[PDB]
Amino acid sequence: GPETISLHRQGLGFTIAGGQGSPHIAGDDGIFISKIIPDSAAKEDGRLAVGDRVLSVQGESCEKITHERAVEMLRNPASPIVLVVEHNAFHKAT
C-alpha cells in the first residue's frame, strides 16, 4: 500500500523517470524512482527504492502529470519533502 516517506534537506537523493509524454513503461505515465543516489538523504533513510511509483509530493498528486511538473514539485525548497509512494510498483506493473 501507499507509504509516507519524509526526507529532510541538508537534494533529496534520487532521480525520477516517467510522466505524461515521456512514459517509463508502455501504457503507464507514472513517476517512478529511477536511482537512489549514494551518500544522500534518500539512501540514509532507506525506505525509498528504485521502481517505486511516486503518488504525491507535499500532498499534491503525481498521477497523470508530466515529468517537468514532477521535477518542479520535487525542487520545492521546503523541508522536509513528504512523499507518498508505492513500493515494487515497477515490478508489480511488469
Coordinates of N, CA and C in Angstrom, one line a residue:
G1 N 0.8 -1.2 0.0 CA 0.0 0.0 0.0 C 0.8 1.3 0.0
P2 N 0.2 2.4 0.0 CA 1.0 3.7 -0.1 C 1.7 3.9 1.2
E3 N 3.0 4.3 1.1 CA 3.8 4.6 2.2 C 4.3 6.0 2.2
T4 N 4.3 6.6 3.4 CA 4.7 8.0 3.5 C 6.1 8.1 3.9
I5 N 6.9 8.9 3.2 CA 8.4 9.0 3.5 C 8.7 10.5 3.4
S6 N 9.1 11.0 4.6 CA 9.5 12.4 4.7 C 11.0 12.5 4.7
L7 N 11.6 13.2 3.7 CA 13.0 13.4 3.6 C 13.4 14.9 3.9
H8 N 14.4 15.0 4.8 CA 14.8 16.3 5.2 C 16.0 16.8 4.3
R9 N 15.9 18.0 3.9 CA 17.0 18.6 3.1 C 18.2 19.0 4.0
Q10 N 19.4 18.9 3.4 CA 20.6 19.3 4.1 C 21.3 20.5 3.5
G11 N 19.6 18.5 -2.1 CA 19.0 17.5 -2.9 C 18.4 16.3 -2.0
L12 N 17.4 15.7 -2.6 CA 16.8 14.6 -1.8 C 17.5 13.3 -1.9
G13 N 18.2 13.1 -3.0 CA 19.0 11.8 -3.2 C 18.4 10.8 -4.2
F14 N 17.6 11.2 -5.1 CA 17.1 10.3 -6.1 C 16.7 11.0 -7.4
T15 N 16.6 10.2 -8.4 CA 16.2 10.6 -9.7 C 14.9 9.9 -10.1
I16 N 14.1 10.5 -11.0 CA 12.8 10.0 -11.4 C 12.8 9.8 -12.9
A17 N 12.0 8.8 -13.3 CA 11.7 8.6 -14.7 C 10.1 8.6 -14.9
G18 N 9.7 8.9 -16.1 CA 8.3 8.7 -16.4 C 7.6 10.1 -16.7
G19 N 6.3 10.1 -16.5 CA 5.5 11.2 -16.7 C 4.7 11.2 -18.1
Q20 N 3.6 11.9 -18.1 CA 2.9 12.1 -19.4 C 3.7 12.7 -20.5
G21 N 3.7 12.0 -21.6 CA 4.6 12.4 -22.7 C 6.0 11.9 -22.7
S22 N 6.4 11.2 -21.6 CA 7.7 10.6 -21.5 C 7.6 9.3 -20.6
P23 N 6.6 8.4 -20.9 CA 6.4 7.3 -20.0 C 7.6 6.4 -19.9
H24 N 7.8 5.8 -18.7 CA 8.8 4.9 -18.4 C 8.4 3.5 -18.7
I25 N 7.1 3.2 -18.8 CA 6.5 1.9 -19.1 C 5.4 2.1 -20.1
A26 N 5.3 1.3 -21.1 CA 4.3 1.4 -22.1 C 2.9 1.4 -21.4
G27 N 2.1 2.4 -21.7 CA 0.8 2.5 -21.2 C 0.7 3.0 -19.7
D28 N 1.7 3.4 -19.1 CA 1.8 3.9 -17.7 C 2.6 5.1 -17.6
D29 N 1.9 6.3 -17.4 CA 2.6 7.6 -17.4 C 3.1 7.9 -16.0
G30 N 3.2 6.9 -15.1 CA 3.6 7.2 -13.7 C 5.0 7.8 -13.5
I31 N 5.2 8.4 -12.4 CA 6.5 8.9 -12.0 C 7.1 7.8 -11.2
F32 N 8.3 7.3 -11.6 CA 9.0 6.2 -10.9 C 10.4 6.7 -10.4
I33 N 10.8 6.1 -9.3 CA 12.1 6.4 -8.8 C 13.1 5.5 -9.7
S34 N 14.1 6.2 -10.3 CA 15.0 5.5 -11.2 C 16.4 5.2 -10.6
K35 N 16.8 6.0 -9.6 CA 18.1 5.8 -9.0 C 18.0 6.4 -7.6
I36 N 18.6 5.7 -6.6 CA 18.9 6.2 -5.3 C 20.4 6.6 -5.3
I37 N 20.6 7.9 -5.1 CA 22.0 8.4 -5.1 C 22.7 8.0 -3.9
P38 N 24.0 7.5 -4.0 CA 24.7 7.1 -2.8 C 25.0 8.3 -1.9
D39 N 25.1 8.0 -0.6 CA 25.5 9.1 0.4 C 24.6 10.3 0.3
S40 N 23.3 10.0 0.4 CA 22.2 11.0 0.3 C 21.2 10.8 1.3
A41 N 20.3 11.8 1.4 CA 19.1 11.7 2.3 C 18.3 10.5 2.0
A42 N 17.9 10.3 0.8 CA 17.1 9.1 0.4 C 17.8 7.8 0.8
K43 N 19.1 7.7 0.5 CA 19.9 6.5 0.8 C 19.9 6.2 2.3
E44 N 20.3 7.2 3.1 CA 20.4 7.1 4.5 C 19.1 6.7 5.1
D45 N 18.0 7.3 4.7 CA 16.7 7.0 5.2 C 16.3 5.5 4.9
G46 N 16.6 5.0 3.7 CA 16.5 3.6 3.3 C 15.2 3.2 2.8
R47 N 14.1 4.0 2.9 CA 12.8 3.5 2.6 C 12.5 3.5 1.1
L48 N 13.0 4.6 0.4 CA 12.7 4.8 -1.0 C 13.6 3.8 -1.8
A49 N 13.0 3.2 -2.9 CA 13.6 2.2 -3.6 C 13.4 2.5 -5.1
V50 N 14.4 2.1 -5.9 CA 14.2 2.1 -7.4 C 13.0 1.3 -7.7
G51 N 12.2 1.9 -8.6 CA 11.0 1.3 -9.1 C 9.7 1.7 -8.3
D52 N 9.9 2.4 -7.2 CA 8.7 3.0 -6.5 C 8.0 3.9 -7.4
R53 N 6.6 3.8 -7.4 CA 5.8 4.8 -8.0 C 5.5 6.0 -7.0
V54 N 5.8 7.2 -7.5 CA 5.5 8.3 -6.6 C 4.1 8.8 -6.8
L55 N 3.3 8.7 -5.7 CA 1.9 9.1 -5.7 C 1.7 10.6 -5.4
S56 N 2.5 11.1 -4.5 CA 2.3 12.5 -4.2 C 3.6 13.1 -3.7
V57 N 3.7 14.4 -3.8 CA 4.8 15.2 -3.2 C 4.1 16.4 -2.5
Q58 N 4.4 16.5 -1.2 CA 3.7 17.6 -0.4 C 2.2 17.5 -0.6
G59 N 1.7 16.3 -0.7 CA 0.2 16.1 -0.8 C -0.3 16.3 -2.2
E60 N 0.4 16.8 -3.1 CA 0.0 17.0 -4.5 C 0.2 15.8 -5.3
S61 N -0.8 15.4 -6.2 CA -0.8 14.2 -6.9 C 0.3 14.1 -8.0
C62 N 0.9 13.0 -8.1 CA 1.8 12.7 -9.2 C 1.3 11.8 -10.3
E63 N -0.1 11.5 -10.2 CA -0.7 10.7 -11.2 C -1.1 11.6 -12.4
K64 N -0.7 11.1 -13.6 CA -1.1 11.8 -14.8 C -0.6 13.3 -14.9
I65 N 0.7 13.4 -14.6 CA 1.4 14.7 -14.7 C 2.6 14.5 -15.6
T66 N 3.2 15.6 -16.1 CA 4.4 15.5 -16.9 C 5.6 15.3 -16.0
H67 N 6.7 14.9 -16.6 CA 8.0 14.8 -15.9 C 8.4 16.1 -15.4
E68 N 8.2 17.2 -16.2 CA 8.6 18.5 -15.8 C 7.8 19.0 -14.6
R69 N 6.5 18.7 -14.5 CA 5.7 19.0 -13.3 C 6.3 18.3 -12.1
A70 N 6.6 17.0 -12.2 CA 7.1 16.3 -11.1 C 8.5 16.9 -10.6
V71 N 9.3 17.2 -11.6 CA 10.6 17.9 -11.2 C 10.3 19.2 -10.4
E72 N 9.4 20.0 -10.9 CA 9.0 21.2 -10.2 C 8.6 20.9 -8.8
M73 N 7.7 19.9 -8.6 CA 7.3 19.6 -7.2 C 8.5 19.2 -6.3
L74 N 9.4 18.4 -6.9 CA 10.5 17.8 -6.1 C 11.6 18.9 -5.8
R75 N 11.6 20.0 -6.5 CA 12.5 21.1 -6.2 C 11.9 22.2 -5.3
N76 N 10.7 22.0 -4.8 CA 10.2 22.8 -3.7 C 11.2 23.0 -2.6
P77 N 11.6 24.3 -2.3 CA 12.7 24.5 -1.3 C 12.3 24.1 0.1
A78 N 11.0 23.7 0.4 CA 10.6 23.3 1.7 C 11.3 22.1 2.2
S79 N 11.4 21.9 3.5 CA 11.9 20.7 4.1 C 11.2 20.4 5.4
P80 N 10.8 19.2 5.6 CA 11.0 18.0 4.8 C 10.1 18.0 3.6
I81 N 10.5 17.2 2.6 CA 9.6 16.9 1.5 C 8.9 15.6 1.8
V82 N 7.6 15.6 1.8 CA 6.8 14.4 2.2 C 6.4 13.7 0.9
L83 N 6.9 12.5 0.7 CA 6.5 11.7 -0.5 C 5.5 10.6 0.0
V84 N 4.6 10.3 -0.9 CA 3.8 9.0 -0.7 C 4.2 8.2 -2.0
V85 N 4.6 6.9 -1.7 CA 5.0 6.0 -2.8 C 4.3 4.7 -2.7
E86 N 4.3 4.0 -3.8 CA 4.0 2.5 -3.9 C 5.3 1.8 -4.1
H87 N 5.7 0.9 -3.2 CA 6.9 0.1 -3.4 C 6.6 -1.0 -4.4
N88 N 7.7 -1.5 -5.1 CA 7.7 -2.6 -6.0 C 6.7 -2.3 -7.2
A89 N 6.4 -1.0 -7.4 CA 5.4 -0.6 -8.3 C 5.8 -1.0 -9.8
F90 N 7.1 -0.8 -10.1 CA 7.6 -1.2 -11.4 C 7.5 -2.7 -11.6
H91 N 8.0 -3.4 -10.6 CA 7.9 -4.9 -10.7 C 6.4 -5.4 -10.7
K92 N 5.6 -4.7 -9.9 CA 4.2 -5.0 -9.9 C 3.6 -4.7 -11.3
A93 N 4.0 -3.7 -11.9 CA 3.4 -3.3 -13.2 C 4.0 -4.1 -14.3
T94 N 5.1 -4.8 -14.1 CA 5.8 -5.6 -15.2 C 6.0 -7.0 -14.7

